[PDB]
Design a protein around this nucleic acid. Structure first.
Ligand SMILES: [Mg+2]
Ligand SMILES: [Zn+2]
Lengths: 71, 455, 358, 98, 148
RNA sequence: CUACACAAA
């Protein structure tokens, strides 16, 4: 229902920056302007968050659905 | 009707003391072994009549009761003619000759394994029970090579398993219905089991002469480690120094020396459709085993494949018995898997991608096919299509178009020019007989061609 | 000598020069500096040590060193009547169990008494995990930025017995410590795998079936260590892993020393041509110990007839088989000295850990 | 896939806590596919972006088997709540609950 | 199952130390046999893995809708531009032994679905006693009737 | 128990 506390694959704690990432991503998408928002590159944002260049961690960070955005 | 008295109640039956669960794979189980979850082993019971010769062995089961495994669930009293649950049997604490103890299923018990629909004689086979003491496992685990008996796979298949509790049924399950008796098909008179998928390509990789790294050799430690999980008596490596290099054929012969056989056949790896391309190593394209020594050649579907008549397991069964063949299938499967534990095998999206030159060549082949089809159409426009007697012009035109749009056998040239046979996982799966066919590769990489429905 | 050579410790840090990151952290956490606990990436170079030992150290640091997690005691989750129906016990317990904590005291107990009196959905954060027992925390054991959950309007979430539980990662992944970052061999040459003729290969110029690398670079990330005491935490982790391996090896040393007494976990045979077979079965033993034992027995006995182990995923045990042209006493002496070499190797590793991190 | 895409676990209902449903599975964590399709503009995606290694690993994934990470299971990968219901009527004044 | 229709039953669960890992520490959640592909022709899953490898590095979510233009050569070149190999393959090490595979292994994010077929629901075991039919005297039918 | 529906191999 939220971004997981740790990455499902390797256990890196992406949940430390889950909330900061969500709100910073909403902000960064807003200045960059449903599908065109998803194609905005978040490499720099996630790197500035401190998360490493790990396929699993960025995958689970950017793809996890937020229940609050749907309910 | 199918659900009437005769067909439902008389010709079939609902039975007690039977279990059903999803089946998954377990590489460490023998072909005649089935993995039984411990929860099911404490549900199904074996009726052991207490006598003087077995009272000491049955005592731990009685003392454990339903609290610890292995235990028991009921005791039939001879002088009472009444069964008593063990939980309520605190005041008995005495096993008499003629008492029947219902104990839990333990490792080594025989069990009937069945998959529906039961079409073959091997659809019900007897496996040795291996109880999986992990409580998190609730599947019926079996070796992937045992799947050929039941036409099973691990995509959701469920299988019935019941443990014989009667002495007569247990005797006959062990002596008559054991899966060693179904190693040779009653239908085709040939072998049923063998290496499948990972083990076929693993046998090929292990026994191939050359790898991209050079000669297919391993040091003494890795040659030893190939035999770690073989679960038989390991060979001797005392004459090998750590610096020594052993071929894959050497370790395969060290395994095959226990049951020496003579085998001489070309492998599935060597095909004439790939011969114009590739560079077939001379030592790879002629498999020869002399008294258990793999002299040369790769081991693949023709030699170790499941249902391969004249293969090495068929010869082992003919000379030493089907149980020895099952043990050798397990041992060779372990060798292949332990080899791929270091070699590694994969398939990638780049494994099925043509080079731009090969793409242009495939385009040219397809364009020539469409050109022949357009020539037939031009002939139809001019009225030059003259059907033979008994054929209409429409049917003759359809036959001409069907033949014109057939892919030539040279469609493999662009495919194989883009493929490295030494490193292509998809090609190696196809060519070794592990999985896939030449039409599969052509459809994936070159083109589907003409869709035919009812010819 | 110095087996554990140069170490590079680099914490993962939030880059506040990014305007969006800084704005979000400020607005919803009032956070302008780095968090109290940061992930630390430790890259270690090892020279003159078998790959079995380096990988055993890595495996232990991943999921065999004892670790601490937050768990809820049975009955800690208060059902009540105004509790959120979407924040189930299982979901919240999964969130809490995987919060990385750097806890020096097991006595600490936390509670989560959250209530949403607003008209909107309120998010519960780790900053709402209030300590209710144990000594007052001079430093936080977890970051306050995790989203434990969200409360529907008018709903609550009360959890009363969030305590600290110890365990190892192979039993439950919430005790996993170190995530893998890098592993390579520095004494094996590598191909330029950017070319089409090498992209299907690993890159190493030697087949793993023949190579014996002794110079390795191992990179492991630790998920939450305090910002000021980074080197101390890393040193403690490394020394604890070395001690864990040494203790597990001594558990088998005792078995060898008790060989005259027929213990069930070691059996010996007298097969044939002066050869004796030693089979050592140890329940709940992993590939770390089996591979270490096999590698060092092989190094001691290069002419061994056979040495090998198997950790079947079921049967939950390690079975190590040694066949050697020697007497039972001779084989036991050789195995004992190989175990002593393993212990010496990991003692040197601990010592070098101390000299390096400092 | 059309068949399997409809038995996939996920957020089977958004109002699940107010429903007494039987044989219904609510999977906690859902992800948008890294490579999404237009179907996810109109329906919620059910599943996760698992890292998948296409490889032979001990022969435990043959014939449609899959080797899973125990840690991925422990962290909540495809974890959820299964729900059953027990509805029992009172018939008439003869029967009562106690 | 994947979105390409490749069903699978979870056969083995391995701890984090037993699972294979790439040189940069990436390890899978699932290990899928390559033999599931060649006969089933589920190239869409393979292409989706190749695309998602670069999507994860770029931090994007792209459209893989059917019949949209696709160029697998350009997707592989995109992988190369992202800093990976032309194929998505990487140097992998065996988690149990620590020894690298001689072959680079194709590993990447493939969207997977958990089909609602639970072994705990499907498994059944009955003992020698239970409810029987009144007419035939045979056991009742199946798990629902608590005997069969 | 008799339909019927949804599913699995
Ligand atoms: Mg099937
Ligand atoms: Zn990760």
């Amino acid at each position: 229902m939220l971004i997981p506390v740790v990455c499902f694959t390797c256990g890196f704690p992406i949940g430390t920056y889950a909330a900061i990432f969500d709100k910073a991503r909403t902000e960064y998408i807003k200045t960059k302007m449903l599908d065109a928002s998803l194609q905005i590159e978040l490499k720099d944002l996630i790197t500035a968050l401190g998360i490493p260049m790990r396929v699993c961690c960025r995958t689970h960070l950017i793809t996890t659905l937020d229940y609050r955005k749907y309910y | 009707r199918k659900e009437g008295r005769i067909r439902k109640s008389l010709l079939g039956s609902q039975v007690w003391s039977i279990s059903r669960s999803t089946i998954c794979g377990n590489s460490d189980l023998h072909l005649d072994e089935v993995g039984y979850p411990i929860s099911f082993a404490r549900t199904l019971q074996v009726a052991e009549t207490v006598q003087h010769y077995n009272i000491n062995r049955l005592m731990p089961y009685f003392l454990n009761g339903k609290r610890q495994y292995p235990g028991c669930s009921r005791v039939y009293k001879q002088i009472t003619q009444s069964v008593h649950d063990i939980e309520g049997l605190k005041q008995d604490f005495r096993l008499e000759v003629g008492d029947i103890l219902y104990r839990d299923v333990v490792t080594g018990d025989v069990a009937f394994f069945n998959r529906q629909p039961s079409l073959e004689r091997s659809s019900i086979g007897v496996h040795r029970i291996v109880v999986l003491e992990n409580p998190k496992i609730s599947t019926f685990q079996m070796n992937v090579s045992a799947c050929a008996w039941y036409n099973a796979d691990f995509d959701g298949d469920q299988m019935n398993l019941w443990v014989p509790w009667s002495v007569m049924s247990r005797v006959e399950a062990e002596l008559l219905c054991s899966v060693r008796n179904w190693f040779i098909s009653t239908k085709s008179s040939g072998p049923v089991n063998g290496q499948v998928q990972d083990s076929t390509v693993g046998s090929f990789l292990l026994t191939r002469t050359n790898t991209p790294m050079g000669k297919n050799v391993m040091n003494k430690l890795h040659a030893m480690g190939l035999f770690q999980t073989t679960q038989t008596d390991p060979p001797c490596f005392a004459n090998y120094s750590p610096t020594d290099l052993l071929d894959g054929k050497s370790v395969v012969s060290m395994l095959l020396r226990q049951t020496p056989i003579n085998y001489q056949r070309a492998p599935t790896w060597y095909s004439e459709v790939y011969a114009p391309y590739m560079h077939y190593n001379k030592q790879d394209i002629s498999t020869q085993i002399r008294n258990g020594e793999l002299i040369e050649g790769v081991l693949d579907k023709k030699a170790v494949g499941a249902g391969s008549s004249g293969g090495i397991y068929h010869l082992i069964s003919r000379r030493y018995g089907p149980q020895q063949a099952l043990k050798m299938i397990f041992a060779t499967q372990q060798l292949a898997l332990n080899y791929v534990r270091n070699a590694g095998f994969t398939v990638s999206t780049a494994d099925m991608l043509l080079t731009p030159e090969a793409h242009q060549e495939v385009q040219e082949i397809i364009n020539e096919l469409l050109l022949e089809s357009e020539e037939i159409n031009n002939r139809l426009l001019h009225g030059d299509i003259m059907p033979p007697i008994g054929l209409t012009t429409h049917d003759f035109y359809e036959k001409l178009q069907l033949n014109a749009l057939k892919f030539p056998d040279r469609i493999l040239k662009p495919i194989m020019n883009s493929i490295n046979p030494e490193t292509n996982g998809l090609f190696q799966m196809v060519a070794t007989g592990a999985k896939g066919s030449n039409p599969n590769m052509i459809h994936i990489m070159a083109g589907i061609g003409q869709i035919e429905i009812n010819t | 000598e110095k087996i554990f050579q140069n170490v590079e410790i680099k914490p993962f840090l939030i880059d506040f020069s990014n305007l969006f990151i800084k704005n979000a952290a400020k607005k919803l956490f009032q956070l302008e500096e780095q968090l109290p606990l940061v992930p630390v990436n430790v890259v270690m170079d090892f020279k003159g040590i078998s790959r079995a030992a380096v990988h055993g150290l890595s495996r232990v640091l991943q999921d065999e060193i004892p670790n601490y997690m937050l768990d809820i005691k049975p009955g800690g989750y208060k059902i009540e009547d105004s509790t959120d129906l979407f924040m189930t016990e299982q979901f919240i317990r999964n969130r809490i169990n995987f919060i990385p904590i750097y806890a020096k005291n097991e006595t600490l107990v936390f509670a989560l008494r959250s209530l949403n009196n607003s008209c909107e959905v309120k998010t519960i954060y780790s900053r709402d995990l209030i300590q209710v027992a144990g000594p007052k925390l001079k430093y936080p054991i977890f970051n306050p930025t995790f989203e434990i959950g969200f409360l529907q309007p008018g709903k609550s979430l009360i959890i009363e017995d969030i305590y600290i539980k110890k365990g190892i990662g192979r039993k439950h992944a919430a005790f996993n410590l170190a995530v893998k970052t890098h592993f390579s061999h520095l004494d094996i040459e590598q191909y330029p795998t950017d070319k089409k003729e090498y992209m299907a290969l690993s890159g190493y110029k030697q087949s793993s079936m023949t190579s014996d690398p002794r110079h390795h670079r191992l990179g492991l990330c630790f998920p939450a260590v305090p910002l000021p005491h980074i080197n101390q935490a890393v040193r403690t982790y490394l020394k604890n892993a070395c001690r864990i391996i040494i203790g597990r090896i001594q558990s088998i040393q005792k078995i060898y020393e008790n060989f005259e007494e027929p213990q069930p976990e070691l059996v010996l045979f007298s097969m044939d041509e002066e050869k004796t077979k030693a089979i050592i079965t140890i329940k709940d033993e992993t590939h770390t110990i089996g591979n270490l034992l096999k590698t060092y027995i092989y190094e001691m006995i290069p002419d061994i007839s056979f040495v090998g182990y198997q950790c079947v995923p079921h049967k939950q045990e390690m079975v190590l088989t040694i066949i050697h042209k020697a007497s039972q006493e001779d084989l036991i002496t050789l195995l004992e000295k190989s175990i002593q070499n393993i212990i010496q190797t990991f003692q040197i590793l601990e010592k070098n850990v101390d000299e390096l991190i400092a | 896939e059309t068949n399997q895409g409809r038995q996939t676990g996920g957020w089977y209902c958004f109002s699940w806590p107010y429903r007494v449903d039987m044989n219904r599975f609510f999977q906690f964590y859902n992800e948008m596919p890294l490579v999404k399709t237009i179907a996810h503009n109109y329906v919620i995606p059910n599943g996760l972006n698992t890292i998948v290694a296409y490889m032979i690993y001990g022969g435990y994934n043959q014939e449609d088997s899959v080797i899973v990470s125990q840690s991925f299971i422990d962290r909540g990968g495809f974890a959820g709540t299964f729900y059953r219901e027990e509805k029992v009527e009172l018939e008439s004044d003869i029967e009562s609950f106690g | 199952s994947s979105r390409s229709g490749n069903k699978g039953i979870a056969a083995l669960a391995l701890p984090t130390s037993d699972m294979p890992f790439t040189e940069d520490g990436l390890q899978p959640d699932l290990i899928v046999n390559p033999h599931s592909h060649p006969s089933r022709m589920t190239n869409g899953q393979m292409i989706e893995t190749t695309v998602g490898l670069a999507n994860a590095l770029q931090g994007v979510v792209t459209d893989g809708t059917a019949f949209l233009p696709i160029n697998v050569q350009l997707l592989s070149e995109r992988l190369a531009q992202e800093g990976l190999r032309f194929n998505g393959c990487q140097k992998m090490f065996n988690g149990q032994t620590g020894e690298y595979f001689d072959a680079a292994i194709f590993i990447g994010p493939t969207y997977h679905q958990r089909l609602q077929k639970f072994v705990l629901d499907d498994r059944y075991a009955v003992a020698s006693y239970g409810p029987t039919d009144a007419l035939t005297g045979q056991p009742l039918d199946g798990k629902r009737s608590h005997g069969g």
